[PDB]
Design a protein around this ligand. Structure first.
Ligand SMILES: [Zn+2]
Length: 226
RNA sequence: AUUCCGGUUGAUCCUGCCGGAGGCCACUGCUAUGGGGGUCCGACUAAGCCAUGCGAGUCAAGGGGGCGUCCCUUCUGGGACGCC
């Protein structure tokens, strides 16, 4: 329980500064699902470090893109690094962030922090015609997302079929806990930031579909942790 | 695998085409130890031209003959089974 020990260390050696951090410190909120759907603002990474400690794992942290941007001045070219990264345990929860820095290490650290701040909660299941099982191995139903010019449509896939999507989508879905999916993309997918944000938006939009109580049993819908 | 990646800018986002990555067929460089199965091998240009050999024969129980052998009456002439 190394991650539990890490969570406890973050709990004692930490002084909360926000209302949500105070709630976590005094124990009013004890589960990760309790900080969502209430309108709370997340501004302290210690909240995520305590509730969902697995996000600090090396295998649970992924660096998606590194870009070298240039700004022109009188003297010459000023170089900045933009790093797009994603974090989250491979079960129910995922987050994406962008960090800017003068050096790649600083940019990576800031991107990881912002991803932890931007963590969200998704829903999983099985809605494929060829599987019809009730395990949370895929998206429960077809979902859509978009950012910039990129439009991504995720379709449920049969169990045992790999993530049929680009590499960025593969990494994001693996971090989110999805194992099988089909994809249809339009627009400039070579724009890594837009592609990642579109996949993230689709995973978030999986929460925007109205469902009946029997659909949960039919598709094995699992919200958050399984 | 219902998928992407490189390229227009000092840097960014688009449209747009070009190129990478897979499968099948025809020529082709280098190289080569075997065995099975199949509906593969002058179709692409010339349905252009050909030496040579072969690629439609069979029937003697439809008919008259010729050669051979045998059995002979025994100059006569008769009967056969072989080949043409
Ligand atoms: Zn299934």
């Amino acid at each position: 329980q190394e991650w539990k020990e890490y969570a406890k260390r973050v709990l004692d050696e930490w002084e909360p500064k926000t209302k949500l951090g105070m709630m976590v410190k005094e124990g009013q909120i004890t589960d990760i699902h309790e900080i969502f759907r209430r309108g709370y603002q997340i501004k302290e990474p210690e909240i995520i470090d305590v509730l969902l400690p697995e996000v600090n794992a090396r295998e649970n942290q992924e660096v998606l893109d590194i870009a070298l941007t240039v700004r022109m001045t009188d003297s010459g070219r000023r170089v900045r690094f933009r790093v797009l990264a994603a974090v989250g345990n491979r079960d129910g929860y995922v987050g994406l962030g962008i960090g800017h820095g003068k050096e790649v290490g600083i940019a990576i650290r800031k991107a990881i922090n912002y991803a932890k701040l931007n963590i969200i909660e998704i829903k999983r299941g099985c809605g494929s015609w060829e599987c019809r099982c009730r395990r949370p191995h895929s998206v429960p139903f077809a979902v859509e997302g978009k950012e910039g010019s990129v439009r991504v449509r995720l379709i449920p896939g049969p169990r045992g079929l790999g993530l049929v999507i680009g590499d960025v989508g593969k990494k994001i879905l693996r971090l989110a806990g999805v194992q099988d999916v089909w994809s249809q993309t339009f627009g400039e997918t070579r724009t890594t930031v837009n592609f990642a944000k579109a996949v993230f938006n689709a995973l978030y939009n999986t929460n925007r579909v109205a469902i009946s109580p029997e659909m949960i049993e039919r598709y094995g819908i699992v919200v958050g942790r399984a």
